[PDB]
Swiss-Prot record, chains A, B:
The gene is cap. This is Adenylyl cyclase-associated protein. The chain holds residues 51 to 226 of 464 of the full protein. May have a regulatory bifunctional role. Binds G-actin and PIP2. Involved in microfilament reorganization near the plasma membrane in a PIP2-regulated manner. Coiled coil: none annotated. The C-terminus is responsible for sequestering G-actin. The N-terminus is required for the PIP2 modulation of cap function. Belongs to the CAP family. It is found in: Cell membrane.
C-alpha cells in the first residue's frame, strides 16, 4: 500500500532532507524538489490503486509534474559546477529518472537499479573523500542509497511487473 | 593526439550530426551543442599537448567552456519531454559527462565507459523500437555508441591514466 511507500520516505528521505539542508544551501534546495517529486509519486501510486490503467496519452499527462521537478533538479546541478558539493548535486541529478519507474513495464525494479548505479558513481566519490572526515556526508550517501535500494524492494513486492492499477477502479484521467 | 581525436569525430560524429538534424530539430539542436563541446575538448587536448599541467584552480577554469555546452545539451533534453525523440535526447543528456574524462585520473577510460552504459540504457530502447523500421534511428545509435567505444580506445592509447600534459611545455593559460 501507499503506507509502505511513505514508510520508505520516513525512514530514509526524512533524515536525508535534513542532512541536505545542513550540508549546503543549493543541495537543500535541490533535495526539496526531489521531496516534492516523491510526494507526487506517492499520489500517483494512490490514484493507480483506485483506477483502471489509463491510455498512453493520459499516462503521458499524469507524469508531467514529476518530469517538471526532474528538470529543476537537473537545472540546479548543471548551473552549480562551481559548488564544493557538485558530487552531491550529481548523485541526485544523474539518478532523478528513478521517478519514472511508474510508467516502466515489466521492469520497474531494474529501472530503479539502473539509476542507483548512476547515483553510486557519484556517491562512491563522496565516501572516498569523506569517510572518517565528515559523517554528515557519509550519512547523506547512506540515506539516499538505502532509499533507492528499499524502493527497488518495494517495487518488487508491490508493483513487480509495473505500477499496480485497478481493473475494477475508476478512470485515471481524473484527480480531485 | 589532436589529429587522432579529430579522426574519431570525422568517423562518427560528423555523420551523426547529419542524422540528428534530419531526425528532428530539437535533436539536431542538442547535437550541435554536443559538437561545440567536442570542439572545446579538442582544443583542451591541444593545450595540454603543449603545456605543463596547471594548478587545480586553473584546471577548473579551463573546463568551463566544455561544461557550459554540457549544461545546454541537458537543458534541451529536459525542456523537450514532448519530443517524439526523447530517447534520442536522453541518450545524449544522460551521458554528456563523458566529456569530463579530461580531468579524471587515473581512470579516464572507465569514466567514459560508465557514461556509455548510461547512453545505452536509452539507445537500447531506440534499437528495440526501430531496428527493421527506421534505418536512420539505427545508424544514429551506431554512430554515438561507436564514438564512445572508440573514445575509450583512444584514451587507452593516448591518455591512459589521464589527459597527457607536457612537463617541458608552456603555460596552459596562454599560448605563443
Ligand atoms: Mg541532466
Amino acid at each position: 500500500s501507499v503506507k509502505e511507500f511513505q514508510n520508505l520516505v520516513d525512514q530514509h528521505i526524512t533524515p536525508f532532507v535534513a542532512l541536505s539542508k545542513k550540508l549546503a544551501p543549493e543541495v537543500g534546495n535541490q533535495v526539496e524538489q526531489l521531496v516534492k517529486a516523491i510526494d507526487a509519486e506517492k499520489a500517483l501510486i494512490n490514484t493507480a490503486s483506485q483506477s483502471k490503467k489509463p491510455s498512453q496519452e493520459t499516462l503521458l499527462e499524469l507524469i508531467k509534474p514529476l518530469n517538471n521537478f526532474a528538470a529543476e533538479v537537473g537545472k540546479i546541478r548543471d548551473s552549480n559546477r562551481s559548488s564544493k558539493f557538485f558530487n552531491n548535486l550529481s548523485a541526485i541529478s544523474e539518478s532523478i529518472g528513478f521517478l519514472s519507474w511508474v510508467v516502466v513495464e515489466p521492469t520497474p525494479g531494474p529501472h530503479v537499479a539502473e539509476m542507483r548505479g548512476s547515483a553510486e558513481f557519484y556517491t562512491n566519490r563522496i565516501l572516498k573523500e569523506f569517510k572518517g572526515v565528515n559523517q554528515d556526508q557519509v550519512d547523506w550517501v547512506s540515506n539516499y542509497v538505502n532509499f533507492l535500494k528499499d524502493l527497488e524492494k518495494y517495487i518488487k513486492q508491490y508493483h513487480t511487473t509495473g505500477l499496480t492499477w485497478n481493473p475494477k477502479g475508476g478512470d485515471a484521467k481524473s484527480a480531485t
